Symmetry: D2
Subunit: 115 residues, 4 copies
């Protein structure tokens, strides 16, 4: 995958499973154009979002749906998504794994960018 997204639930110590993810690419105007979407697997991963040729250079936003992920815990999170923006392929071709460790009011997110 040129791009994969990993989501972990830092409250329960588990992959975040069957969580909706939206990817956008910043358009000519300021706007976020829909790029790819899906839901995480049993390992918290979302594979197969894009291909090398559709994954052109640009600014990408990854939005992970969180609003009600937390509901069973009794907590409303800081925002209905966890989002991370990254600038891609601006020096040539690269695989990106976006790793998110999520809590209702905190998250850590790392971009692992390889050959």
């Amino acid at each position: 995958c040129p791009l994969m997204v990993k989501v972990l639930d830092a409250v329960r110590g588990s992959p975040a499973i069957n969580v909706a993810v939206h990817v956008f690419r910043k358009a000519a105007d300021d706007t976020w154009e829909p790029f790819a979407s899906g839901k995480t697997s049993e390992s918290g991963e979302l594979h197969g979002l894009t291909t090398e040729e559709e994954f052109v250079e640009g600014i990408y936003k990854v939005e992970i749906d969180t609003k009600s992920y937390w509901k069973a815990l009794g907590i409303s999170p800081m925002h209905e998504h966890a989002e991370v923006v990254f600038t891609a392929n601006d020096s040539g071709p690269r695989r990106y794994t976006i790793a998110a460790m999520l809590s209702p009011y905190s998250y850590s997110t790392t971009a692992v960018v390889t050959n």
Copy 2:
């Protein structure tokens, strides 16, 4: 302070000093409208951004400039900003502190929301 932003450099273990912070609010033509801005202090803190009156319920984005903050390190970051989005005042008025611990390819943020 209804809204405070605190920025830490996780690479050198210090406050991120004199860093530009721009706050936006989602405008409902769905664009981000400029809301407040400032530069972090010697303690990495940014106070005085808004007033309990301007600071209504809504969706806010805190954009921390990092385009060149890493330059002396010789690393170009994952993105030219660090952004944190939060929904405010979904249930009455609150003080928000957005704490961002930053690295070039990572970051950890917690929103601390107090009722005072």
Copy 3:
């Protein structure tokens, strides 16, 4: 303060208040000698742990008590403490803030080391 510890609850979005903190300094024998302790304030902070005189060069462990912090959420955490180890004043005189953002199965810590 030569040493202060600040604890945030990443689940609830609030300072972690009245939480026990233990500080140790590594002895001659590999043993952790107790150094200072307390409970966090209403701001999640623990001030007044040490004096610049008592804060001699060495390896320090900060242990934040988390075992039952989470009890009301119905979650038992990964460990009964959140712990961070740092090597101190290896160059002169310096003030440390140890900042911990805590969830049951994740934490982020950073050492802010000044002047």
Copy 4:
């Protein structure tokens, strides 16, 4: 795998490759006894550390060597290790993945525990 460790370099945005990891278990005399060790792969991962039968309930410390990992960056880190302590299995046999996103003066760890 009962215990897997995955290390990411949060400064460069890559897997931390060929990094030494030592695992310890809290022993009878309150010391840390050596329990397993290895080096991270090209994916930042360390598999094969232990066996279901070796990995009994207890308190485990994962120590990641970071003494010179940062040297080329010109920064000496907060400590010569990144250590994560967890209380294993405390409810029956589980698989553990300890994910550590590392910077010189910070870190985020997450324990993923799966049944």
